Amino acid sequence: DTLVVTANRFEQPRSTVLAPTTVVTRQDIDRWQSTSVNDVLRRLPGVDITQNGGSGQLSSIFIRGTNASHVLVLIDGVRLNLAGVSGSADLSQFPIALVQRVEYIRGPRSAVYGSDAIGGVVNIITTRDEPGTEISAGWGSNSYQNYDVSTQQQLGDKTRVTLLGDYAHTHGGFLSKTLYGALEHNFTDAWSGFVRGYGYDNRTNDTRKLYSQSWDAGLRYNGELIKSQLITSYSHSKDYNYATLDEMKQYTVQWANNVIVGHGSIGAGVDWQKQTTTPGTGYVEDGYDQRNTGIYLTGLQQVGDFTFEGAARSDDNSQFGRHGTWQTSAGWEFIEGYRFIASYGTSYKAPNLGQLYGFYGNPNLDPEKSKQWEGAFEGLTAGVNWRISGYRNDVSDLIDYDDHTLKYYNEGKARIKGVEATANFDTGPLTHTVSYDYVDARNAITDTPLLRRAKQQVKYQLDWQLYDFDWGITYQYLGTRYDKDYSSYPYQTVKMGGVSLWDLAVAYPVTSHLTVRGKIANLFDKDYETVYGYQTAGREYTLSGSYTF
Numbered sequence: 430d431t432l433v434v435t436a437n438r439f440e441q442p443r444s445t446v447l448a449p450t451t452v453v454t455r456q457d458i459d460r461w462q463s464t465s466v467n468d469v470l471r472r473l474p475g476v477d478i479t480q481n482g483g484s485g486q487l488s489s490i491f492i493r494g495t496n497a498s499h500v501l502v503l504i505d506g507v508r509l510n511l512a513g514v515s516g517s518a519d520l521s522q523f524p525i526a527l528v529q530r531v532e533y534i535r536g537p538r539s540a541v542y543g544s545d546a547i548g549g550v551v552n553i554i555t556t557r558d559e560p561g562t563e564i565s566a567g568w569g570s571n572s573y574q575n576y577d578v579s580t581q582q583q584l585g586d587k588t589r590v591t592l593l594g595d596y597a598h599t600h601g602g603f604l605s606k607t608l609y610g611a612l613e614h615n616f617t618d619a620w621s622g623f624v625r626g627y628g629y630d631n632r633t634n635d636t637r638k639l640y641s642q643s644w645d646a647g648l649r650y651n652g653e654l655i656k657s658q659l660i661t662s663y664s665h666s667k668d669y670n671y672a673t674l675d676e677m678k679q680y681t682v683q684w685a686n687n688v689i690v691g692h693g694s695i696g697a698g699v700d701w702q703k704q705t706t707t708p709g710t711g712y713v714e715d716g717y718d719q720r721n722t723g724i725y726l727t728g729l730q731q732v733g734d735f736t737f738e739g740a741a742r743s744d745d746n747s748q749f750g751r752h753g754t755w756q757t758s759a760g761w762e763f764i765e766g767y768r769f770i771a772s773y774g775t776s777y778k779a780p781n782l783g784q785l786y787g788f789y790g791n792p793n794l795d796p797e798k799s800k801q802w803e804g805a806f807e808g809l810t811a812g813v814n815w816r817i818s819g820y821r822n823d824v825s826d827l828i829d830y831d832d833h834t835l836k837y838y839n840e841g842k843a844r845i846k847g848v849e850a851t852a853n854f855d856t857g858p859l860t861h862t863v864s865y866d867y868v869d870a871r872n873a874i875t876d877t878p879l880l881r882r883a884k885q886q887v888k889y890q891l892d893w894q895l896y897d898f899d900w901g902i903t904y905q906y907l908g909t910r911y912d913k914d915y916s917s918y919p920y921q922t923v924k925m926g927g928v929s930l931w932d933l934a935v936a937y938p939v940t941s942h943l944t945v946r947g948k949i950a951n952l953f954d955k956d957y958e959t960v961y962g963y964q965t966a967g968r969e970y971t972l973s974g975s976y977t978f
């Protein structure tokens with residue numbers, strides 16, 4: 430789709446966002462037959478996801494060679510709570526059934542959102558406008574089972590309700606049960622309100638029990654020139670392993686405005702966050718109270734063939750104090766349908782609980798800091814939409830353990846040089862969506878490649894319909910990756926060879942109300958790991974259906 434909200438919080442055409450952007454819709458997710466968020470993200474440019482096995486197991490997201498803690502994940506605009514204790518986003522627990530849209534914008538965005546937005550930003554949206562009720566379910570390899578009931582209806586004029594329940598289970602397993610309710614209200618044709626509440630109960634296998642609930646409420650104004658939003662959020666998670674218990678409550682309040690001025694816009698906002706942990710959470714002795722407040726400004730202008738886009742933010746954190754970030758981009762459409770874009774931006778990552786207050790803690794840590802430069806050419810040629818970008822990311826003040834003193838300090842440096850190339854085009858009835866990433870991510874002090882990241886990836890999606898059958902084939906090449914073997918000491922660095930992977934999916938409208946679908950994932954039964962030592966699934970079959978009325 431064309432409109433995004435994730436670049437500056439407010440709706441704008443993608444063509445006007447100078448950073449590389451990707452949008453995934455629910456229609457996309459339904460066709461691909463993804464059974465996890467990771468399976469969605471894995472398909473997209475610059476994404477390198479590793480996982481300790483199959484569904485539900487611990488996983489890491491490396492966007493454009495950056496550390497796992499250097500991606501900002503938002504759910505409906507607000508920092509994912511599950512990232513809260515460890516200070517690093519893991520989506521393996523977040524229910525796929527709740528995903529209605531993903532908006533993913535690469536490059537820095539601390540200047541809008543604050544901490545973590547270094548490699549990029551991933552915004553998982555849970556809202557839909559899609560009247561009706563749906564029942565669906567599926568069955569697959571490894572005793573995979575799913576069923577789900579969902580309904581959105583009008584409760585008179587101005588108010589609409591959404592209700593969802595979902596059960597997902599797999600064995601070696603992982604069991605996830607989810608409930609979601611939302612109420613939306615139009616006071617007028619410009620003033621809106623919403624209240625949202627959801628929660629899930631996950632069990633994974635040593636056993637993990639994870640409870641998470643989130644409540645959001647807000648008010649929005651959508652006028653001809655002026656747009657505003659006041660947004661409230663509360664998330665509570667309890668993560669049991671066995672025993673340890675990690676428990677965090679996260680409080681968010683944000684107020685943002687934006688106005689259309691000429692061929693462009695200007696915006697500002699204030700963003701407050703409180704996180705509270707329980708004693709013994711995150712292997713820290715005491716319970717902690719962390720607070721952050723940020724203020725920022727955005728801008729977009731089009732003059733002639735040129736486009737200018739920018740943001741700047743000041744954050745005040747209860748532990749490290751004040752840190753400012755900014756970014757600026759310019760695009761030149763030098764000939765119709767072609768653009769050169771140049772970008773610069775700074776971003777940062779806040780120290781986490783363990784690093785500050787754990788056994789090896791240092792309460793005076795400063796943030797990790799990033800500087801990025803990016804240049805791109807984008808075009809439309811002979812029916813092909815394409816883009817190629819080169820970026821450099823210098824990361825400094827990395828928080829590292831010193832074995833000399835058994836404490837964490839700011840000191841490491843990394844340098845990432847990367848290339849992203851993308852294209853989409855049709856050939857008769859066939860649709861092609863392709864990307865290539867080169868990622869040269871290095872310790873800038875030793876000049877050694879960083880571990881766990883593939884230097885090269887190729888991803889290819891091929892879609893077409895013939896009789897009434899909707900077919901999709903997905904191809905991925907995962908390049909070579911260096912990792913450590915933790916089965917025994919000492920921990921040896923190993924070299925995992927590149928692998929090719931293929932998936933095949935089909936759908937068919939049995940009626941206008943009933944759609945049946947099947948999928949064979951890892952069609953050639955390739956044996957491979959994304960984390961050394963941890964076996965992935967192998968060839969799996971899934972058969973599913975959805976009935977709408």
Ligand SMILES: CCCCCCCCOCCOCCOCCOCCO
Pocket residue numbers: 693695726727728729730737738739740741755756757
């Ligand atoms: C009235 C200010 C609104 C935009 C401020 C955020 C921009 C932060 O850096 C921009 C300054 O750096 C050079 C700006 O050059 C072009 C300005 O960007 C145009 C935004 O409308």
Ligand SMILES: CCCCCCCCOCCOCCOCCOCCO
Pocket residue numbers: 690691693694695728729730
């Ligand atoms: C590297 C030095 C830092 C320079 C800071 C520059 C501050 C930005 O000032 C330029 C602002 O220009 C336009 C501001 O935003 C206007 C948005 O819409 C304007 C309508 O035409």
Ligand SMILES: CCCCCCCCOCCOCCOCCOCCO
Pocket residue numbers: 741755
């Ligand atoms: C609203 C747009 C904001 C753009 C401003 C970004 C410009 C960055 O300013 C320069 C960076 O900060 C200067 C650091 O000062 C050097 C430290 O030396 C002090 C020694 O005590």
Ligand SMILES: CCCCCCCCOCCOCCOCCOCCO
Pocket residue numbers: 697724725726741742743752753754755
């Ligand atoms: C509407 C508020 C807009 C705030 C944007 C400024 C915050 C981002 O600033 C950029 C940070 O880069 C330099 C600022 O940090 C240096 C602090 O210097 C203060 C004393 O000289």
Ligand SMILES: CCCCCCCCOCCOCCOCCOCCO
Pocket residue numbers: 764767806807808
């Ligand atoms: C790195 C970006 C490269 C930009 C290359 C574009 C330079 C010229 O592009 C094509 C200009 O128009 C030519 C299109 O082909 C002829 C179509 O003529 C119109 C049909 O009557």
Ligand SMILES: CCCCCCCCOCCOCCOCCOCCO
Pocket residue numbers: 804805806817818819820821845846847848
């Ligand atoms: C504007 C797109 C960048 C072009 C992609 C590959 C073209 C290579 O030109 C020379 C190769 O550059 C050597 C290093 O390439 C990786 C660096 O990426 C840019 C980071 O500085």
Ligand SMILES: CCCCCCCCOCCOCCOCCOCCO
Pocket residue numbers: 815816817848850851852863864865867
């Ligand atoms: C891509 C280099 C020449 C100009 C780009 C044309 C359109 C690019 O779409 C390519 C999508 O397919 C992947 C291309 O992979 C080769 C580019 O890799 C650059 C090597 O550093």
Ligand SMILES: [Mg+2]
Pocket residue numbers: 833
């Ligand atoms: Mg020494």
